[PDB]
Every structure is written in structure tokens, then in C-alpha cells.
Design a protein around this ligand. Structure first.
Ligand SMILES: [K+]
Ligand SMILES: [K+]
Ligand SMILES: [Mg+2]
Ligand SMILES: [Mg+2]
Ligand SMILES: [Mg+2]
Ligand SMILES: [Mg+2]
Length: 222
RNA sequence: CAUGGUUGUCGUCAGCUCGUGUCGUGAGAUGUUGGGUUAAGUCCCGCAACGAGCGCAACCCUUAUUGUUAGUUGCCAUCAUU
């Protein structure tokens, strides 16, 4: 990935100065118009390191979980994870998604069961009220667990856009010792992320560019 | 004031909890709170929770309309009679 490609996508824009994390100075180039400008020279080095790291993860056949619920990130991380063949969370992270995995599976299992009825003919002999109700129930589960519905186990790596926003996802990863690859903004804490990518979290073309490379890495490694 | 069973009572009020997860040194907390809504912990949305059980509701009885089957010991519209 090119330094101009990052610049065109606006990967350099940080947050307002007063809202920074002091630990991010290591990745900041300068400040402009009241905002911190990320150092793209290190961004290229770090995104390449993440690219190889994600690849080496896929080579093992391990699972990757793309987490991002930001408005800017929600559409991309869905597309790329499906594109890469991996699993994603893009609407809302459920507390216990991974730490409470056993209980969560009973809900993913429910989704499979209700999908079966539709492809089994039970909905044809249902008294309207049930089928309408179970359709709503299926819709909610797909709303939440659809992106991970087919995840075979707890992921070997988690990719997070705006880890500051995705606070619970970072906590569930630390608990389970799942390394995190994240786009880290000027306001985010880098010490919680094993593979840092200093990047803007608030520009769609910025999230699309970085997410695509990480998704491609999993395509290439597998 | 040793008990089983049975009963009143708050009160047909809406609640009472559990499993797993998470927070807390700990007792505990979370869920069950919040924004709406409902007769209702009723439902929806939001949420470090995700689900489940006992309750709520429904399934039961009666009452209000009606088709059909039945027509005596019930009934008398169309008939003659008392
Ligand atoms: K508990
Ligand atoms: K009848
Ligand atoms: Mg209560
Ligand atoms: Mg209830
Ligand atoms: Mg709630
Ligand atoms: Mg009842």
C-alpha cells in the first residue's frame, strides 16, 4: 500500500488535539488546523506488518473476526470479511460473544433451527402468529449473530475498527488472549493492540482501504 | 413455638429468582436498570450481557350472535279442531 493511497483516502486525519491519547505521540507527525496528523511513513510500515501478520495467521487455517460497528466501518467490514471468507460483527457486540461462547451458540443454533423450518415446511403448517413471530426472532438473530453464525470456534485473531468505540470487543479479546489488529486513531490506546495500524477511523475510504488489505492478506494466506 | 396436610393474608399485586458470562479485594452487582409501552418483569428499542424457570398472558367454564345435526316429555308458524 502506497503513502499516496493512504493520503488520498485521508488516513492521516486524527481527532481534535484535546481528545488525543498521549501514547499516540509515537505515531503522530504534526498538528494542523487543530487536529493531529498521523505519520503515514510509519503507517505504511505498520500496515505492511499487519498484512504479513494476518497472512501468517491464515496460513494456519485459523479464524479471523472482523469487528466494527462504526457507521463508517459497518458496511466495509461486512463485505471484506465475507469476501475473505471470514466472520464479522458489524451492528452490535454482544457481551459474552466469545467469553460466553457456549451460551451464545445456543442462540446461533436457534437461528439454524428456525432456518430449517423455512426449508423444511414447518412454516406451512404454522398458525400465522407463530411464523410471523419466528420471522421476527430470526431477523433479530441475523441482525446480531448473522455475521458470525458460521464461525467454527473462538477466532485466532480479531480485526477492530476504532477499538476505543469497540471497548467490549477489546476486553473479550484480552480475556481470551486473542491478538488484535486494529486501526488506531489519535484518541485510541495503542498498548491494548498487538498489531497497531495508525489510521483514521472516521473516513469511509480510509476504513475501506485498510480493511481490504487485511482481508486480502487472509485471502492470500489461505 | 416439635410437625404433615389444609387455610387466611399482602394480592391476581407483579413480581421472585436461576445458569453462563462480566464487574467488584469483598459482601455484592449486572441481567431485572434505562427510553417507550402495557392490566402485566406486557411488548419493543437501547444496554455487559446472553438465556432460562416460577408467576403475567393463553389453553378451561359460563354469558352475548350464529350454521349444522337432533324434534320428546320442549315448541305451535302455516292447518282442522279443544
Ligand atoms: K450471575
Ligand atoms: K347449536
Ligand atoms: Mg425485581
Ligand atoms: Mg414474563
Ligand atoms: Mg434490558
Ligand atoms: Mg393466568
Amino acid at each position: 500500500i502506497s503513502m499516496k493511497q493512504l493520503l488520498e483516502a485521508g488516513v492521516h486525519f486524527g481527532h481534535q488535539t484535546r481528545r488525543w491519547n498521549p501514547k499516540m505521540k509515537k505515531y503522530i507527525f504534526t498538528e494542523r488546523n487543530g487536529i493531529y496528523i498521523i505519520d503515514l511513513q510509519k503507517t505504511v510500515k505498520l500496515v505492511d506488518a499487519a498484512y504479513d501478520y494476518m497472512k501468517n495467521v491464515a496460513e494456519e487455517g485459523g479464524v479471523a473476526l472482523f469487528v466494527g460497528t462504526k457507521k463508517q466501518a459497518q458496511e466495509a467490514i461486512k463485505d471484506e470479511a465475507i469476501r475473505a471468507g471470514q466472520y464479522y460483527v458489524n451492528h452490535r457486540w454482544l457481551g459474552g460473544t466469545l467469553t460466553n461462547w457456549d451460551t451464545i451458540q445456543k442462540r446461533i443454533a436457534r437461528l439454524k433451527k428456525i432456518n430449517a423450518m423455512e426449508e423444511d415446511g414447518t412454516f406451512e403448517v404454522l398458525p400465522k402468529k407463530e411464523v410471523a413471530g419466528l420471522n421476527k426472532e430470526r431477523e433479530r438473530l441475523e441482525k446480531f449473530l448473522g455475521g458470525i453464525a458460521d464461525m467454527p470456534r473462538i477466532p485466532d485473531v480479531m480485526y477492530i475498527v476504532d477499538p476505543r468505540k469497540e471497548r467490549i470487543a477489546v476486553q473479550e479479546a484480552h480475556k481470551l488472549n486473542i491478538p488484535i489488529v486494529a486501526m488506531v486513531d489519535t484518541n485510541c490506546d495503542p498498548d491494548e493492540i498487538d498489531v497497531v495500524i495508525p489510521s483514521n477511523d472516521d473516513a469511509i475510504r480510509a476504513v475501506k482501504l485498510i480493511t481490504a488489505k487485511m482481508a486480502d492478506a487472509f485471502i492470500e494466506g489461505n
